[PDB]
Amino acid sequence: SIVTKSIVNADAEARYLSPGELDRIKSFVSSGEKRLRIAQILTDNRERIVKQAGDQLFQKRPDVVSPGGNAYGQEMTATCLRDLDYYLRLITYGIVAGDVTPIEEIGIVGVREMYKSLGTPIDAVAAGVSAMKNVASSILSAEDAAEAGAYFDYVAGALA
Amino acid sequence: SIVTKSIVNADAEARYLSPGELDRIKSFVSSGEKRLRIAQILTDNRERIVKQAGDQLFQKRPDVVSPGGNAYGQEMTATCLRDLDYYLRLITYGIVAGDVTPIEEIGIVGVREMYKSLGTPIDAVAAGVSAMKNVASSILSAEDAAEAGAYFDYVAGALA
Amino acid sequence: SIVTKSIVNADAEARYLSPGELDRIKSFVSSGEKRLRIAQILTDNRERIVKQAGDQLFQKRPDVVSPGGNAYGQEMTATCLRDLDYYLRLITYGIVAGDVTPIEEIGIVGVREMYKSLGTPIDAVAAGVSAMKNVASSILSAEDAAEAGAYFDYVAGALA
Amino acid sequence: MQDAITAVINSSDVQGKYLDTAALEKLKSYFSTGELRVRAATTIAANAAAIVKEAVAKSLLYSDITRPGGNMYTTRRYAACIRDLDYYLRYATYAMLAGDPSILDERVLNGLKETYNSLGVPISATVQAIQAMKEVTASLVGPDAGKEMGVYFDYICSGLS
Amino acid sequence: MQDAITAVINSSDVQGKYLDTAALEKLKSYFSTGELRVRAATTIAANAAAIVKEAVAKSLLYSDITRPGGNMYTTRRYAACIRDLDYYLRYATYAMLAGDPSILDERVLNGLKETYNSLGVPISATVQAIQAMKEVTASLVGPDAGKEMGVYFDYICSGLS
Amino acid sequence: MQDAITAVINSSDVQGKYLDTAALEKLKSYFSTGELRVRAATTIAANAAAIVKEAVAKSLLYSDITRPGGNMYTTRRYAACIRDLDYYLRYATYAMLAGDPSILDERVLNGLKETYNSLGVPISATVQAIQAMKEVTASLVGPDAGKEMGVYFDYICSGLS
Amino acid sequence: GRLFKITACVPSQTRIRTQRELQNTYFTKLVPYENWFREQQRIQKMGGKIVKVELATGKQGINTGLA
Ligand SMILES: *[C@H](C)[C@H]1/C(=C/c2[nH]c(/C=C3N=C(/C=C4\NC(=O)C(CC)=C4C)C(C)=C\3CCC(=O)O)c(CCC(=O)O)c2C)NC(=O)C1C
Ligand SMILES: *[C@H](C)[C@H]1/C(=C/c2[nH]c(/C=C3N=C(/C=C4\NC(=O)C(CC)=C4C)C(C)=C\3CCC(=O)O)c(CCC(=O)O)c2C)NC(=O)C1C
Ligand SMILES: *[C@H](C)[C@H]1/C(=C/c2[nH]c(/C=C3N=C(/C=C4\NC(=O)C(CC)=C4C)C(C)=C\3CCC(=O)O)c(CCC(=O)O)c2C)NC(=O)[C@@H]1C
Ligand SMILES: *[C@H](C)[C@H]1/C(=C/c2[nH]c(/C=C3N=C(/C=C4\NC(=O)C(CC)=C4C)C(C)=C\3CCC(=O)O)c(CCC(=O)O)c2C)NC(=O)[C@@H]1C
Ligand SMILES: *[C@H](C)[C@H]1/C(=C/c2[nH]c(/C=C3N=C(/C=C4\NC(=O)C(CC)=C4C)C(C)=C\3CCC(=O)O)c(CCC(=O)O)c2C)NC(=O)[C@@H]1C
Ligand SMILES: *[C@H](C)[C@H]1/C(=C/c2[nH]c(/C=C3N=C(/C=C4\NC(=O)C(CC)=C4C)C(C)=C\3CCC(=O)O)c(CCC(=O)O)c2C)NC(=O)[C@@H]1C
Ligand SMILES: O[B-](O)(O)O
Ligand SMILES: O[B-](O)(O)O
């Protein structure tokens, strides 16, 4: 959140917030409507966005669900969708927040060591997120899709 | 005190005091009765020194005792004289120790922050201290005035 | 020993031991029985090695056993030999450990400060250790004497 | 530290839930108090020195605390005391701006009671001073902003005792 | 830290004695197992990641620990946890190699329990994970080396209790 | 730290008083002994190693303390110990010159008993060795200076017990 | 090697520091044996007061095996 970021900076310089920082906060709190709207829509369609995104991912990345793949099997595949759901949720937190800090703190820091250990091909996880963006892109207004897209692109870029 | 300074210097180098430091300590102690005498003259004439110093200050700085001024009112004017007395007391301590360490630790470190918060014009306090020097110089021999003078000058320079 | 050193180095780099370190430990343990043997013969001839090194030292440095000398007198002389025995024992530890670390930690670090305070001529203690090397030569094969000698030289070199 | 937004996000994340209706309600309440908070902050920053000055005059000056033998005697100690008051004000303002006290625990109350007890700083007198600033700040920012700032002033106080 | 060798030496030194029979037996005993220790460390090093992976899968995955609310939830905590397991394995190996637990007290256990308690890291779940590592490790190095590694895994476990 | 001069100034200051008769006498007493304190310090510095050597010889040498198993065994620990003695002698001399023990509280006793106890450094033996230094110093500086130095040697000992 | 677990309080004797120094004022930290003498003295000269000293690594009187 921009409020926290501003407080952290001001505190680092042992001063109150600068008029510029306080103004950006004013703007932030008022221009929230469109972002909460976007988050709500993604939340409501979660089951569908993830389900269809999985389908796309497996079509483009069949290796992950074939003998030897990390998500091979009914249960393993279910776990894969569970992770996509985790990220979709994280994406909604980031959208309402106005930045990718919640996404970064809950699901990006250490993500490579986690998946590296599990044997999960992280680039494929990136693909599933891109897929969710795609599916989401058929539910959001071209503008809402454009704004939320920045968040999806972040997670995807970070998942490599 | 030169004794404390020499020890601190000596310890910083994990060594015994040098012949020079020990010699300076010898002069310091033998010069003890002299410094105590000067400090006594000030202590004895403290009321007149402070009272007449205030008179000079308020003459040169009528704004401090006029409405809106920091020392406006008899109570407030009394507190102003009390501070001058504090500094005069600190000055006698300095004289005895041979240096300004007693004065700075007790009344110089943080003095600007203190007076700025109180709303007291520190430059006027310096002037008041200089006035106490002027008055004290009317009872100290040229040699004694020269010695005590450096302490008043240190305080005035540090307050200004 | 080399086991600790390798571990200390590996830990410094947050890594497992290198193949070379592991190979060095393999040589260390396999050559264990030999080092035990060498140290054992020194241990078995300790009394003679110390006594003879003593006579040799005193014939060479009579000043230490003459009036005013550090080892002057029967009790002082016995204490001097007590020290040679201390070092012989330390040398046997080093031989078994494979390095001089036991000797360094037990009898080298602070040694110059100790003897200086005591007034003991350190160079003579060194010469006494070299005298022990010579006596050990008369009871060790050339291969053993060369292996053991490196320790004796370390000690004599550090006691300069 | 965390603000009111992040605080809600984290409460939902620990449950593994997408933000629901109530969570979303809390978020709106914050966003809607945003300009009032910024205003109060802007004011407080301007009156920073004056708030402390008055609080000090009201609770500490002309007592035993400032006279020889007091913990506020010597210019060095007086200055340190008002500096702390400055910290408390600034930090409480931060917390109010954020609508969350976490910054207070993380940056103010963290090892403070120990430092004060160790140095001999009278805890009670400090609490009185912080509370004097509460009364002073309230009369400047209005009852609402004053109530908010107050929860934070009291938060610091409670952590001292 | 000491290894089996320097440990015996230090104790003979404290008595002021040349290595006696008991001391010599101990040194010899270490020396006769030396290659077995190296062999075991080689295997562990080569299967380091795999050991942790199976241990985690056996004792930590698909439980409340990894789900929202559990200490392994969030990619940061997951990574931190397995990083710990990596530390334990690497240190237990050092200790096994040295034939002495001193490195564990000096470089690992020292105030570890306190750090965990303050962070909320479940000591019980951690011990479980270490115990699982013991089994996985033994399946690669054989019973004897598995038992010797077990000694150091158990030592780390006792230090957390 | 403070010397006899500053100690008086500080006690007067805490009372907010100018130097009264009692305080002026305390100051005159210090001034009249200054040259004598300087003379003693000169002598002590010239015989520092000698003082420590004789003291150690009288109190520590040829005992369990220096034999295998003793805390003064190993050249490493022998050096640490005589280094401490060197430190005690130097600080005691400073305290003597200052005519005030504060420097000992601040720079010697400050956490010493704890370091010693955690390390297992024998405090009884340390006290005996400082006691010995007191005796050796007195035989070089004369009865009066020997008693003044004794005040500071004892101060250190009391802080260790 | 050998490690000390120490706690101290170091005040401000020269300037009225305005940046958050509470973190640098009251502290608890591990200090390697070979650094304790120099560190302890550093705090002592700064008018700081030492509250607690412990041998964190436990083993006292090690003759050999200090790494
Ligand atoms: C012999 C080659 C010469 C000699 C020796 C000498 N040493 C001493 C006294 C002491 N020596 C030690 C030595 C050590 N302490 C340790 O912990 C270790 C490491 C294992 C060593 C080597 C100590 C502690 C003493 C002090 C007596 C004691 O045991 O407590 C003396 C006596 C000195 C005296 O005046 O008392 C002597 C004579 N003297 C020589 O001239 C040489 C060359
Ligand atoms: C894993 C089995 C589980 C778990 C662990 C966990 N640990 C931590 C954080 C830390 N771990 C350590 C431990 C070490 N550091 C070292 O240098 C060494 C060896 C010498 C060890 C053993 C430390 C110091 C920390 C502290 C912070 C850090 O990251 O360094 C965490 C993160 C805690 C947090 O919220 O920040 C976790 C999650 N958690 C589990 O649920 C289990 C079962
Ligand atoms: C799906 C795109 C692909 C895939 C996924 C997959 N993941 C797992 C297992 C786990 N994933 C996680 C993930 C998270 N934990 C967190 O705290 C966060 C942040 C919010 C995330 C994203 C965890 C902890 C696990 C371990 C299982 C558990 O829940 O405890 C699997 C199963 C792996 C296995 O072998 O068990 C799979 C299949 N697999 C693919 O190939 C993908 C491209
Ligand atoms: C006189 C030259 C002028 C002046 C003085 C003035 N001072 C105050 C109030 C205070 N002054 C102090 C001073 C000190 N505290 C210390 O510890 C030391 C060091 C020894 C000093 C010098 C303090 C603490 C106060 C606060 C009151 C108290 O004693 O508790 C006032 C009163 C201001 C008010 O608003 O109440 C005044 C008037 N004022 C001038 O204008 C002068 C040039
Ligand atoms: C003022 C109302 C009263 C008072 C205060 C007082 N405080 C100190 C010294 C310190 N105060 C702090 C506090 C903080 N530093 C921080 O970083 C934070 C958090 C952001 C806080 C709250 C600290 C660390 C110190 C010690 C270090 C320093 O001074 O910089 C003093 C001086 C103590 C001394 O004797 O030197 C005083 C006087 N004293 C009163 O009587 C009050 C009622
Ligand atoms: C000597 C009479 C005896 C003795 C001493 C001994 N001391 C140590 C170790 C330390 N001594 C200190 C001492 C001080 N720290 C200070 O700040 C001051 C004042 C200026 C003193 C005197 C410290 C900090 C240590 C530990 C750290 C270090 O050595 O640098 C040892 C060594 C302990 C060890 O196990 O290695 C010894 C042996 N021991 C005796 O038996 C005495 C009677
Ligand atoms: O300290 B001088 O420099 O030796 O006088
Ligand atoms: O230690 B080597 O360098 O790897 O042998």
Side-chain angles (χ1 to χ4, degrees):
Chain A
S1 168
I2 203 181
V3 178
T4 291
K5 292 170 177 173
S6 297
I7 294 174
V8 169
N9 287 158
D11 195 39
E13 299 174 314
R15 60 170 178 80
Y16 279 83
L17 264 64
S18 75
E21 297 173 322
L22 286 168
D23 182 61
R24 280 169 290 227
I25 289 185
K26 289 225 307 182
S27 307
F28 173 78
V29 302
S30 64
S31 45
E33 45 76 55
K34 189 199 161 179
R35 255 162 32 247
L36 281 65
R37 184 217 303 159
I38 293 182
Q40 192 63 281
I41 293 173
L42 293 182
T43 299
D44 294 349
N45 292 266
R46 98 190 73 138
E47 299 165 39
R48 185 189 142 214
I49 302 167
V50 184
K51 177 58 196 104
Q52 292 187 239
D55 292 323
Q56 290 190 25
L57 173 60
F58 304 146
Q59 184 181 49
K60 299 144 68 66
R61 290 299 301 266
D63 51 297
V64 310
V65 285
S66 294
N70 187 251
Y72 178 60
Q74 195 163 294
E75 338 70 32
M76 293 296 116
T77 296
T79 308
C80 182
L81 299 212
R82 192 279 319 260
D83 288 12
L84 293 183
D85 181 64
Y86 272 175
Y87 283 111
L88 216 218
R89 188 167 51 87
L90 266 37
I91 282 167
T92 66
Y93 294 158
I95 288 168
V96 312
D99 58 42
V100 300
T101 298
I103 310 181
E104 180 207 334
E105 297 182 339
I106 304 157
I108 296 301
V109 185
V111 75
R112 286 187 300 248
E113 293 68 72
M114 177 187 81
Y115 279 136
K116 186 193 174 191
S117 184
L118 293 161
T120 305
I122 198 171
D123 60 292
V125 186
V129 178
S130 298
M132 289 195 289
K133 166 191 169 174
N134 189 21
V135 182
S137 292
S138 73
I139 318 169
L140 295 162
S141 320
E143 78 154 312
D144 284 359
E147 194 170 303
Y151 298 84
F152 278 99
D153 291 9
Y154 166 70
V155 181
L159 296 182
Chain B
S1 161
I2 185 73
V3 176
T4 304
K5 284 176 184 163
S6 300
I7 295 172
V8 166
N9 292 356
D11 197 24
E13 298 172 51
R15 54 162 186 85
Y16 280 83
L17 280 60
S18 62
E21 292 167 334
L22 294 163
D23 283 347
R24 289 194 288 282
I25 291 181
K26 304 220 295 193
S27 294
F28 170 72
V29 299
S30 59
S31 183
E33 302 309 293
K34 188 271 290 265
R35 294 195 313 279
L36 285 177
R37 189 196 66 245
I38 304 178
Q40 202 52 214
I41 292 174
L42 300 174
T43 306
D44 297 342
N45 297 256
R46 69 176 177 285
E47 188 211 321
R48 188 172 81 79
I49 289 180
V50 173
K51 184 181 183 179
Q52 296 187 344
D55 292 329
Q56 280 178 43
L57 175 67
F58 304 146
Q59 182 172 232
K60 290 297 189 64
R61 290 296 301 260
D63 57 299
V64 305
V65 288
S66 297
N70 194 247
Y72 167 71
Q74 70 179 0
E75 290 64 40
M76 298 294 175
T77 293
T79 309
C80 170
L81 264 62
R82 183 215 58 189
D83 285 9
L84 293 181
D85 178 70
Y86 274 176
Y87 282 105
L88 211 229
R89 177 164 57 81
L90 267 42
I91 284 169
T92 67
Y93 290 173
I95 296 177
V96 166
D99 61 47
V100 303
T101 301
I103 310 179
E104 76 167 319
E105 300 192 320
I106 301 164
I108 298 298
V109 176
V111 72
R112 297 189 185 273
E113 293 90 320
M114 176 183 78
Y115 281 135
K116 170 62 187 55
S117 183
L118 288 168
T120 307
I122 200 168
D123 63 293
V125 182
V129 170
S130 301
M132 291 201 286
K133 180 189 172 181
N134 302 339
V135 177
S137 296
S138 78
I139 45 186
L140 293 170
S141 68
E143 61 178 287
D144 283 3
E147 178 155 355
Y151 294 93
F152 284 97
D153 291 335
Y154 165 75
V155 181
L159 283 171
Chain C
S1 78
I2 183 64
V3 185
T4 302
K5 286 178 173 57
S6 298
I7 290 176
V8 170
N9 293 340
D11 199 21
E13 292 168 54
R15 63 178 175 67
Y16 279 76
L17 274 67
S18 72
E21 292 165 342
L22 293 173
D23 283 335
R24 241 120 58 202
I25 294 176
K26 290 216 224 78
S27 297
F28 164 71
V29 300
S30 50
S31 58
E33 304 310 295
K34 177 192 58 155
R35 300 198 318 278
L36 275 172
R37 196 201 74 245
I38 301 181
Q40 188 62 56
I41 98 96
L42 288 185
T43 294
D44 290 343
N45 301 145
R46 95 196 75 135
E47 200 57 43
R48 189 199 140 208
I49 299 168
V50 173
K51 234 285 288 151
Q52 284 189 222
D55 305 335
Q56 186 184 138
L57 172 60
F58 303 155
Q59 185 64 94
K60 169 187 158 178
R61 291 290 307 264
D63 56 301
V64 305
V65 282
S66 299
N70 192 71
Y72 177 67
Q74 204 174 42
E75 300 61 55
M76 300 295 87
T77 278
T79 302
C80 171
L81 295 206
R82 195 271 323 257
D83 287 9
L84 293 179
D85 178 65
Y86 266 175
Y87 281 105
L88 215 216
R89 178 168 57 79
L90 258 42
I91 285 168
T92 72
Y93 291 163
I95 292 177
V96 170
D99 56 34
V100 305
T101 298
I103 318 174
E104 181 197 19
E105 293 178 325
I106 300 164
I108 295 302
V109 180
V111 79
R112 294 202 158 91
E113 292 68 55
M114 173 182 76
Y115 280 137
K116 176 189 177 196
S117 188
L118 292 165
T120 304
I122 204 172
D123 54 298
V125 184
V129 179
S130 299
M132 286 201 293
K133 182 188 179 178
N134 294 332
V135 184
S137 298
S138 306
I139 192 69
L140 280 169
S141 74
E143 187 180 319
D144 286 9
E147 185 173 347
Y151 296 97
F152 278 101
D153 287 328
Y154 161 71
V155 179
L159 287 172
Chain D
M1 66 164 285
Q2 56 177 25
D3 50 34
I5 300 166
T6 304
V8 177
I9 288 175
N10 291 164
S11 53
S12 299
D13 179 60
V14 67
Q15 300 177 52
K17 290 174 182 170
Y18 278 81
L19 300 157
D20 56 34
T21 297
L24 257 30
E25 176 190 66
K26 272 193 247 60
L27 288 176
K28 286 184 292 297
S29 307
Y30 179 66
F31 288 127
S32 56
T33 51
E35 181 164 33
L36 264 26
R37 289 172 194 274
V38 172
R39 285 177 175 211
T42 305
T43 291
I44 290 166
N47 283 128
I51 285 162
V52 172
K53 180 182 186 177
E54 188 165 352
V56 167
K58 274 295 299 170
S59 60
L60 303 165
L61 299 191
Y62 295 104
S63 64
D64 39 281
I65 294 178
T66 51
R67 285 198 296 279
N71 198 241
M72 257 187 108
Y73 176 71
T74 74
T75 54
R76 191 183 65 74
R77 279 185 166 120
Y78 189 107
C81 177
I82 60 175
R83 176 214 50 203
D84 289 5
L85 258 7
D86 293 344
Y87 283 142
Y88 297 145
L89 189 61
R90 185 161 57 83
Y91 277 101
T93 300
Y94 284 160
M96 175 275 290
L97 219 30
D100 190 280
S102 60
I103 193 179
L104 300 180
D105 293 307
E106 294 191 10
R107 303 259 191 58
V108 185
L109 299 172
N110 201 350
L112 182 59
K113 199 174 170 303
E114 296 65 52
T115 305
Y116 275 2
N117 283 140
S118 165
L119 292 166
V121 174
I123 300 275
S124 189
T126 303
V127 169
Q128 299 183 295
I130 295 174
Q131 276 163 347
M133 289 200 301
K134 186 171 73 181
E135 301 182 285
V136 176
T137 307
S139 72
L140 303 173
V141 297
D144 298 285
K147 185 177 184 61
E148 186 68 347
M149 282 296 304
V151 329
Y152 301 121
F153 279 140
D154 290 328
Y155 200 88
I156 299 172
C157 292
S158 292
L160 282 170
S161 38
Chain E
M1 68 165 270
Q2 284 156 0
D3 48 50
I5 299 313
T6 52
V8 168
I9 289 170
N10 190 67
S11 48
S12 287
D13 189 53
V14 171
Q15 302 302 126
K17 305 196 199 93
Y18 280 81
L19 301 158
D20 59 38
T21 300
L24 296 167
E25 299 319 307
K26 274 175 157 293
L27 296 164
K28 278 161 54 200
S29 177
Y30 175 76
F31 287 147
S32 65
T33 60
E35 339 284 342
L36 301 186
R37 297 180 187 268
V38 167
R39 189 68 248 146
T42 307
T43 310
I44 297 166
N47 295 96
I51 294 168
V52 172
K53 183 186 184 179
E54 191 178 335
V56 176
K58 247 174 60 78
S59 60
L60 306 164
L61 306 189
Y62 303 105
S63 70
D64 293 335
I65 305 168
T66 56
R67 287 192 286 273
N71 199 238
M72 263 188 106
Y73 178 64
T74 72
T75 52
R76 187 186 64 82
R77 291 185 167 160
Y78 192 114
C81 176
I82 62 192
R83 185 211 61 216
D84 282 7
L85 263 5
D86 291 354
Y87 280 127
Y88 297 138
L89 190 56
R90 183 164 58 82
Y91 276 103
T93 307
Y94 286 161
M96 176 280 295
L97 237 8
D100 195 283
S102 60
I103 191 175
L104 295 177
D105 291 312
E106 298 186 3
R107 302 185 187 214
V108 179
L109 298 174
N110 172 235
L112 187 58
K113 192 179 182 179
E114 68 181 307
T115 306
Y116 279 171
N117 289 156
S118 82
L119 286 171
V121 175
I123 289 179
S124 183
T126 303
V127 172
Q128 291 171 356
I130 299 180
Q131 286 307 102
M133 279 211 289
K134 182 167 69 171
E135 178 179 76
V136 179
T137 302
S139 80
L140 294 160
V141 299
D144 290 8
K147 191 179 176 65
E148 183 65 12
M149 280 294 302
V151 172
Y152 303 98
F153 279 132
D154 282 3
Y155 195 91
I156 294 179
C157 282
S158 295
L160 287 172
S161 302
Chain F
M1 65 158 280
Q2 42 186 16
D3 52 29
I5 300 308
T6 300
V8 169
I9 286 169
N10 291 169
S11 36
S12 290
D13 184 54
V14 181
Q15 287 185 306
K17 300 197 203 306
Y18 276 75
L19 300 163
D20 55 39
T21 295
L24 290 172
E25 297 326 289
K26 272 191 154 172
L27 298 169
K28 292 180 219 156
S29 301
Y30 180 76
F31 292 142
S32 60
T33 65
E35 230 275 68
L36 303 177
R37 297 176 184 272
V38 168
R39 187 69 249 147
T42 295
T43 301
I44 297 161
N47 296 89
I51 295 170
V52 173
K53 176 186 178 171
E54 188 182 331
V56 171
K58 257 64 189 200
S59 58
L60 301 164
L61 298 197
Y62 298 104
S63 70
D64 276 336
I65 302 154
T66 54
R67 290 176 215 127
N71 195 245
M72 218 186 153
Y73 176 63
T74 72
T75 56
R76 177 169 49 77
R77 291 209 300 261
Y78 190 111
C81 180
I82 66 181
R83 172 210 61 202
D84 284 6
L85 261 8
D86 290 348
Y87 273 81
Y88 293 136
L89 183 65
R90 190 168 43 88
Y91 276 103
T93 308
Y94 291 154
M96 180 278 295
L97 281 162
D100 191 278
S102 64
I103 188 175
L104 302 174
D105 283 314
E106 295 179 26
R107 309 191 180 197
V108 178
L109 300 173
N110 204 338
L112 192 60
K113 189 171 185 162
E114 282 192 307
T115 301
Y116 273 11
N117 286 134
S118 61
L119 285 178
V121 174
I123 291 184
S124 185
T126 306
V127 164
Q128 293 167 33
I130 298 165
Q131 283 306 102
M133 285 201 296
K134 180 175 61 175
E135 216 253 66
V136 180
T137 302
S139 54
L140 293 165
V141 298
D144 300 321
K147 275 194 185 199
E148 186 63 1
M149 276 296 295
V151 170
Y152 304 109
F153 280 124
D154 291 343
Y155 200 85
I156 295 177
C157 295
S158 305
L160 286 180
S161 304
Chain G
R2 302 158 294 166
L3 245 52
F4 283 99
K5 167 80 169 291
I6 66 88
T7 300
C9 179
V10 185
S12 194
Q13 59 178 296
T14 80
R15 187 232 305 176
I16 306 302
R17 294 181 165 72
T18 192
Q19 232 295 282
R20 173 177 158 64
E21 217 74 50
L22 173 57
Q23 349 149 319
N24 310 287
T25 298
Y26 206 75
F27 61 80
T28 300
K29 60 179 186 171
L30 299 176
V31 182
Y33 178 97
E34 30 292 317
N35 300 307
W36 188 224
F37 199 108
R38 191 191 168 285
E39 179 63 4
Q40 176 174 10
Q41 285 208 101
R42 183 204 130 243
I43 296 169
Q44 291 171 167
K45 302 181 188 184
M46 293 186 305
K49 174 256 305 173
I50 297 174
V51 190
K52 186 67 201 153
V53 183
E54 312 182 291
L55 186 60
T57 52
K59 256 73 170 201
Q60 26 175 251
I62 307 178
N63 290 156
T64 185
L66 315 172

